[PDB]
Amino acid sequence: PISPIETVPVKLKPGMDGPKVKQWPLTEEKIKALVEICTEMEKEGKISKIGPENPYNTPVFAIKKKDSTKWRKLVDFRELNKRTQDFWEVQLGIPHPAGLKKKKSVTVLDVGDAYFSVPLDEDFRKYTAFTIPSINNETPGIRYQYNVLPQGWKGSPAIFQSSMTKILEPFKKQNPDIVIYQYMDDLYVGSDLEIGQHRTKIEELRQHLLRWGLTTPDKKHQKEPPFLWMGYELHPDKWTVQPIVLPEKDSWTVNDIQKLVGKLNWASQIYPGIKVRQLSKLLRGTKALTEVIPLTEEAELELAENREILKEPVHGVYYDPSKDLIAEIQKQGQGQWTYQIYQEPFKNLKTGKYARMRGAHTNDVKQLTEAVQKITTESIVIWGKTPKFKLPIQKETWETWWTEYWQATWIPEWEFVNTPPLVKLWYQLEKEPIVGAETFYVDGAANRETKLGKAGYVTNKGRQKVVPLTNTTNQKTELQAIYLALQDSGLEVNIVTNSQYALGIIQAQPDKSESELVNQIIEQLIKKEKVYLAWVPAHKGI
Amino acid sequence: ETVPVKLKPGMDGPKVKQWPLTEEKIKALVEICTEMEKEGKISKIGPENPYNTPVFAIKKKDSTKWRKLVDFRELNKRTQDHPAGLKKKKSVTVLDVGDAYFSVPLDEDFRKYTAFTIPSINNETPGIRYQYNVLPQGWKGSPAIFQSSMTKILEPFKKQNPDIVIYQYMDDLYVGSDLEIGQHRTKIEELRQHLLRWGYELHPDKWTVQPIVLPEKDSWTVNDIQKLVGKLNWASQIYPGIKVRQLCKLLRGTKALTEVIPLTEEAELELAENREILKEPVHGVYYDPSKDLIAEIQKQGQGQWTYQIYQEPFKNLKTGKYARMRGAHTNDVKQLTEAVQKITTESIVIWGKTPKFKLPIQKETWETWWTEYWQATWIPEWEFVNTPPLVKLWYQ
DNA sequence: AATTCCCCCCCTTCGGTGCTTTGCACCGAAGGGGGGG
Ligand SMILES: Nc1ncnc2c1ncn2[C@H]1C[C@H](O)[C@@H](COP(=O)(O)CP(=O)(O)OP(=O)(O)O)O1
Ligand SMILES: [Mg+2]
Ligand SMILES: [Mg+2]
């Protein structure tokens, strides 16, 4: 039926009118399916026939549901969506099974014909006018307007989510011990009651929903485990993802690589060690989605590793609020990190990765801090509390970094775990000049017309060099001058630069850069035993 | 009574996403908002309202009670529009008078602009939306609609005690006296009682400017002279008159950084003259009420932070230090939050305007952890600096 | 050339902003995938 719920008042944007978009030609199978759907909808009062008094139209079409025997009628409301008032979305995220607590009795319910059970604002119905084109043209089209929430309109999801919340509020208030996860029309219902009492409560909930015009057909009412909920299979003690199929293709295109990367990112929520950086690097530079991309050796090795990971059967566990959350982080190399959130050893609540590359130049400590922040925010989302971190960084290393860093940085309660590779800073800059070491005064110049530049240095002992550079900028010439200074020195060196770009990068202790001049300097700085770098105001007589 | 509030011309309204919250914060928000809706202060709304401002909860110092706070900075910016003796008082107590605010109904054409969303743990349910029916805590037009009632609960004390200077900013009453503390702390109790029937001590004088200081040493090396020349050249932008033209002559030619350079008589003279120039205060800076205040913070290590409040570059209205000797809270984020709150409080005391902060922190770390240590009812505008300072030893 | 909507995530690209070393670094929005209904 249709909900007796109050309609949400909806208006158009100021100064705008309703859509007047013509119906595009439609496949005769699609036309017949739409005709039958519209006949049933009009018999049920969900759509209403309209005549010449309505000057609006919007194209309709149909797709195939997961039922593959029923059709989903959709309306291309893009013009109406652009001319519709703005909404605020109430769905702020996706529920996760790792955030679920253990329940003795579980029932999954799907509300049937969800959108079409919620009435639409009467003043807005005229803008939802559509036309079902006749089979083989000839006859004029049957023109309808929506009396309920249409699929394709940008206001339908939020309105349905508010209506479902309002409908569920009385039952939840009168049954506070029952847990109800509400995602659109999908309802997970968990309780600690006996199976008979739980089924009685489920029948009570179904009766409450039917009074508001929401049906809960037995076809999609799950009573026994495993429960298919939100893309997961829920068992009484463990949860798993629904089977994730990785293509076994021998020729890969850009779109196929994107699909595989997305599927591996999805699988990384429970499967440990999933890496996608090598495959994702194949997407840079490319253009057409149909362009075949030859898989490199590194990409093939990551794909084989991910496949080897995904053949074993893994499962998550349900949250235990009495025990403590522990997130352990591991370095995967090349800026990739894995992490496992668990409360008991070898029983993961959830798994994940962090591989975002922020900044042109960075080190492992900064990336570990970023990963810790990401895991912290994800844990606050899922369980509402920050976990205890097991980080592969020594307390001395973190102390040195955060005391000697010019930014405010922090990591929540964490303990060091001795699992290599360990996070460490690969070089340190001397706080004072080194006595007995050659002092290099370096500089880099570049006129911004011809893009030609000079990198030079002189030492206190008389040595000098003046390498010329092509297609470089002032910044790049200063970095080059520092590079010469590092190359042409012993294990201990004092370098005086008149560049704050250079000193600003080199002082942040980079260990990896999206530049080969900074990356080359990094290898020279790791070899030297002591390096003092000093800025001196430039043209001053120094 | 209802004041016809309006927005600035050609401005839509706040549309800001709600950040994730902890279980304790969400539970506190749910309880507070259930009580507020039961009392009619806030009303449940749907998604047809397109506006939204962030909301969270704090626990004030020595209170053990949760307080709901709403980030109204965007609404304050979009809303269509000082006791100078306050900086010279000895004890300024801050009182929260935001509770009297929830009794004046807000204009119905403006309630939609005060929408906020409570999130759910694990996204079990869709976020619960509310709008304010009364004057909200955090909005800049709320104190502008209580002025009348305030300047009437105040008059019977603001005249009985003409010496005490009372200022009001947002939800806070800064009441500053020159009495002995035992006395100022009794008057304040009397004022509390006089606000109870009608419905944090600062010491603004123990506040000092941090001057620019040059190193004092027996022997000066080439590195020392290069650092001194750099510092003096940077300070020449702030204090014109700094010669540094003969101290740049001892650094002539290529020399080792550890080589000791004897300071010539002219160099010593110029150094003494520059020290005298740096010691005397900078003249020619005036607070322009039309312009906005900018506060820059630099981390100095060992729990030391420097800050400069200015309206134009190199024309500093204030310089200071927040020295929280890193002890138990060796949290950089906690120290930075505590420094930001202190600087905002002194900016409101001195000029009446909160400054725009240039935070020496990554944005994501701040958005993650700043609510865990915030204890003020206001929130200043802040931008995040992602560039080493180096001009960080030029302030400490 | 098949055409829809909303939500979360990751990964890549581009234009805008800020500072002033005018290039470079950084951040948000938008494009593609994944998952949910
Ligand atoms: N591709 C899509 N485009 C637009 N809207 C879409 C959508 N998939 C799901 N939705 C929205 C509308 C459905 O009413 C609602 C429920 O999603 P649903 O896919 O379970 C179908 P429903 O209409 O409830 O009926 P029934 O088949 O169970 O009898 O989710
Ligand atoms: Mg469904
Ligand atoms: Mg359904």
Side-chain angles (χ1 to χ4, degrees), chain A residues 181-182 358 373 384 402 441, chain B residues 23 122 255 299 364-365:
Chain A
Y181 269 69
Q182 170 208 331
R358 315 177 75 267
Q373 278 149 206
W402 90 261
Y441 295 90
Chain B
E23 178 161 74
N122 203 30
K255 281 203 214 62
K299 191 173 138 191
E364 313 62 359
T365 323

Side-chain angles (χ1 to χ4, degrees), chain B residues 70-80 82-151 153-158 160-184 186-215 217-242 244-282 284-324 327-333:
Chain B
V70 196
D71 179 33
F72 275 129
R73 288 180 275 166
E74 316 59 44
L75 184 60
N76 289 337
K77 276 185 304 255
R78 281 154 205 263
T79 273
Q80 218 303 297
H82 153 268
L86 196 60
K87 61 201 314 203
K88 310 145 179 330
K89 312 269 127 162
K90 141 189 308 203
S91 324
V92 172
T93 295
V94 190
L95 285 204
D96 200 72
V97 287
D99 230 320
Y101 271 16
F102 283 168
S103 275
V104 192
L106 167 90
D107 175 42
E108 313 225 353
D109 313 322
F110 202 83
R111 302 179 171 197
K112 55 157 144 300
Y113 298 126
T114 71
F116 63 94
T117 321
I118 294 166
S120 197
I121 294 302
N122 203 30
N123 296 111
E124 163 182 325
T125 86
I128 313 117
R129 308 248 304 142
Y130 296 89
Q131 72 179 11
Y132 273 88
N133 311 146
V134 297
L135 276 182
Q137 290 164 1
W139 176 48
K140 95 166 190 222
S142 180
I145 296 165
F146 198 79
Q147 252 160 334
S148 37
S149 356
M150 211 26 121
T151 60
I153 303 165
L154 281 195
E155 267 3 270
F157 181 101
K158 221 173 114 125
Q160 170 139 13
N161 306 338
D163 58 289
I164 298 188
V165 163
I166 305 192
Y167 175 79
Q168 179 201 224
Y169 192 79
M170 300 267 149
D171 308 352
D172 282 305
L173 269 191
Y174 303 122
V175 300
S177 76
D178 264 321
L179 275 105
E180 100 105 330
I181 267 291
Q183 280 179 284
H184 151 104
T186 48
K187 230 139 225 119
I188 258 51
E189 179 57 70
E190 293 338 291
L191 181 173
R192 274 206 334 111
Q193 299 296 281
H194 167 60
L195 241 142
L196 194 147
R197 328 137 359 191
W198 258 92
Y200 178 29
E201 350 241 7
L202 328 175
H203 301 283
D205 50 8
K206 303 210 289 243
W207 283 354
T208 22
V209 127
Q210 263 237 274
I212 307 179
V213 63
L214 301 187
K217 42 194 54 152
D218 325 312
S219 34
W220 292 68
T221 76
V222 171
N223 185 48
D224 294 343
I225 306 191
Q226 298 165 345
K227 285 182 302 200
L228 178 88
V229 164
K231 185 183 241 269
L232 286 183
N233 155 102
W234 156 86
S236 97
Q237 297 160 318
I238 317 173
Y239 292 67
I242 298 269
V244 86
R245 211 225 78 256
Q246 280 195 283
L247 280 154
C248 295
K249 260 164 34 61
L250 307 143
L251 295 173
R252 275 201 138 135
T254 321
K255 281 203 214 62
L257 291 196
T258 59
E259 172 165 356
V260 186
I261 302 289
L263 265 218
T264 59
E265 317 293 46
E266 300 89 18
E268 279 267 354
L269 150 106
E270 280 189 3
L271 185 60
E273 144 197 313
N274 286 187
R275 293 153 155 291
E276 293 314 278
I277 295 179
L278 286 190
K279 190 140 40 56
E280 67 97 38
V282 48
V285 301
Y286 316 106
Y287 167 63
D288 200 288
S290 100
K291 301 204 214 254
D292 252 331
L293 293 162
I294 316 137
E296 305 199 345
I297 316 195
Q298 297 96 17
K299 191 173 138 191
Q300 301 293 337
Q302 294 93 60
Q304 312 293 310
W305 311 72
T306 53
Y307 62 88
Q308 302 84 43
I309 306 160
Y310 62 89
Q311 285 190 331
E312 233 54 67
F314 301 127
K315 299 283 200 39
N316 286 346
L317 296 167
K318 216 219 173 281
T319 70
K321 218 214 289 283
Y322 168 75
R324 219 355 227 103
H329 78 314
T330 42
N331 187 335
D332 260 357
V333 190

Side-chain angles (χ1 to χ4, degrees), chain A residues 417-468:
Chain A
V417 50
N418 190 38
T419 298
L422 255 65
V423 173
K424 50 158 305 205
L425 288 157
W426 291 97
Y427 65 91
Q428 336 269 337
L429 295 182
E430 300 303 279
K431 295 142 226 283
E432 291 301 336
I434 312 149
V435 47
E438 218 176 16
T439 287
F440 286 67
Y441 295 90
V442 310
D443 40 331
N447 188 315
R448 29 171 294 185
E449 259 76 39
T450 166
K451 288 215 78 124
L452 235 58
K454 249 141 336 272
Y457 77 79
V458 313
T459 90
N460 69 315
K461 299 194 208 338
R463 325 212 270 95
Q464 26 184 303
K465 197 193 337 283
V466 224
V467 300

Side-chain angles (χ1 to χ4, degrees), chain A residues 25-31 33-65 67-135 139-192:
Chain A
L26 272 184
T27 288
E28 264 66 61
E29 209 211 342
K30 255 72 153 173
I31 294 191
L34 279 161
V35 161
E36 313 334 321
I37 286 161
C38 285
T39 288
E40 310 334 328
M41 291 195 64
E42 216 270 342
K43 197 174 323 311
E44 279 146 19
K46 310 174 159 359
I47 53 176
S48 255
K49 296 208 184 94
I50 50 150
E53 83 282 345
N54 199 303
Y56 311 111
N57 203 78
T58 292
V60 282
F61 59 106
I63 62 163
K64 232 142 190 293
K65 291 204 205 159
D67 221 283
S68 291
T69 82
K70 309 142 64 183
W71 285 79
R72 177 188 311 279
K73 165 177 196 293
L74 300 170
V75 200
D76 180 28
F77 272 131
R78 281 192 238 113
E79 216 49 62
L80 181 59
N81 283 338
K82 282 176 20 180
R83 307 221 255 260
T84 299
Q85 65 147 89
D86 280 339
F87 290 82
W88 189 256
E89 310 297 321
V90 288
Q91 191 63 43
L92 314 181
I94 325 294
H96 204 277
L100 289 175
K101 288 156 226 246
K102 164 142 188 45
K103 300 270 152 171
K104 182 179 319 145
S105 298
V106 160
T107 280
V108 177
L109 268 181
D110 200 281
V111 162
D113 271 88
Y115 287 13
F116 299 158
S117 297
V118 177
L120 175 73
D121 181 41
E122 305 200 299
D123 295 324
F124 206 81
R125 296 179 185 185
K126 64 164 97 84
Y127 307 125
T128 66
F130 64 96
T131 304
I132 297 300
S134 45
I135 359 239
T139 123
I142 328 109
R143 300 197 58 229
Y144 298 96
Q145 80 180 15
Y146 262 95
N147 306 324
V148 289
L149 291 185
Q151 310 195 39
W153 185 48
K154 77 154 190 225
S156 285
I159 288 169
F160 179 83
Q161 277 155 9
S162 285
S163 300
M164 176 66 93
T165 291
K166 281 199 219 191
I167 286 160
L168 283 180
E169 166 259 325
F171 186 88
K172 295 178 72 216
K173 121 237 144 167
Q174 90 159 9
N175 300 281
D177 65 292
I178 319 283
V179 163
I180 300 185
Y181 269 69
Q182 170 208 331
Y183 190 84
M184 342 247 120
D185 59 315
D186 195 27
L187 299 182
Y188 159 95
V189 189
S191 82
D192 295 305

Side-chain angles (χ1 to χ4, degrees), chain A residues 352-356 358-396:
Chain A
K353 53 170 268 266
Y354 177 78
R356 186 185 164 131
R358 315 177 75 267
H361 336 280
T362 194
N363 39 72
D364 281 315
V365 183
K366 267 187 271 187
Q367 300 192 327
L368 179 79
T369 307
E370 296 160 13
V372 153
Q373 278 149 206
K374 183 215 136 93
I375 296 154
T376 292
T377 206
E378 177 222 88
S379 289
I380 284 154
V381 166
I382 294 172
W383 305 280
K385 88 190 210 221
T386 313
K388 302 174 334 153
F389 279 99
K390 281 180 180 165
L391 303 189
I393 179 168
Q394 309 246 45
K395 293 255 164 192
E396 313 81 68

